[PDB]
């Protein structure tokens, strides 16, 4: 299993303009548009990304497009960030899909504030890590998505994918 597999399975794939779970104007597997209450926004937003006059619709593969930036992105961003580079350096393959998907939904900056638990996943702490991980909102907001990273973080498989 791979990244998009499971960024597939935890984002659904929509190709119309459509609310995330936090109400915000979003397209693909999981492409944000805009943070803003107007829909004329979020298609001006989709437009610009696409190229084209999209009518807020787009095709599979213009998702697919957008899906090979955003995690390209992602990991980019993982990259270059000081708080997250060692963490991810110091990971298995497994584990580094899980930090990959946490820093895709909720951004560098959000991930780069879990102090605690991005310690003790560098020092291999699994355990104590996925105990840490799950009282934060992310946890409360999107519990059945936050099981299945956490119990990647915790096992090193993929077996919460595995049933999916």
Same mark, same amino acid.
């Given at each position: ?8 399975? #935890?984002? $659904? ?6 609310? +995330? ?25 989709? +437009? ?12 599979? #593969? ?5 899906? /090979? ?7 980019? $961003?993982?990259? =270059? ?10 990971? #298995?393959?497994? =584990?580094?899909?899980?930090?990959? /998907? ?10 780069? $504030? ?12 699994? +355990? ?10 992310? @946890? ?15 096992? $090193?498989?993929? +077996?919460? @994918?595995?049933?999916?």
């Amino acid at each position: 299993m791979n990244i998009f597999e499971i960024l597939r399975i #935890d984002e $659904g794939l929509r190709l119309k303009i459509y609310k +995330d779970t936090e109400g915000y104007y979003t397209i693909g597997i999981g492409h944000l548009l805009t943070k803003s209450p107007s829909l004329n926004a979020a298609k001006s937003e989709l +437009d610009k990304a696409i190229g084209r006059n999209c009518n807020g619709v787009i095709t599979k #593969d213009e998702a697919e497009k957008l899906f /090979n930036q955003d995690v390209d992105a992602a990991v980019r $961003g993982i990259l =270059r960030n000081a708080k997250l580079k060692p963490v991810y350096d110091s990971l #298995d393959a497994v =584990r580094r899909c899980a930090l990959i /998907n946490m820093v895709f939904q909720m951004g560098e900056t959000g991930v780069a $504030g879990f102090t605690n638990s991005l310690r003790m996943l560098q020092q291999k702490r699994w +355990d104590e890590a996925a105990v840490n991980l799950a009282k934060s909102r992310w @946890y409360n907001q999107t519990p059945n998505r936050a099981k299945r990273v956490i119990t990647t973080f915790r096992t $090193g498989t993929w +077996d919460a @994918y595995k049933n999916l």
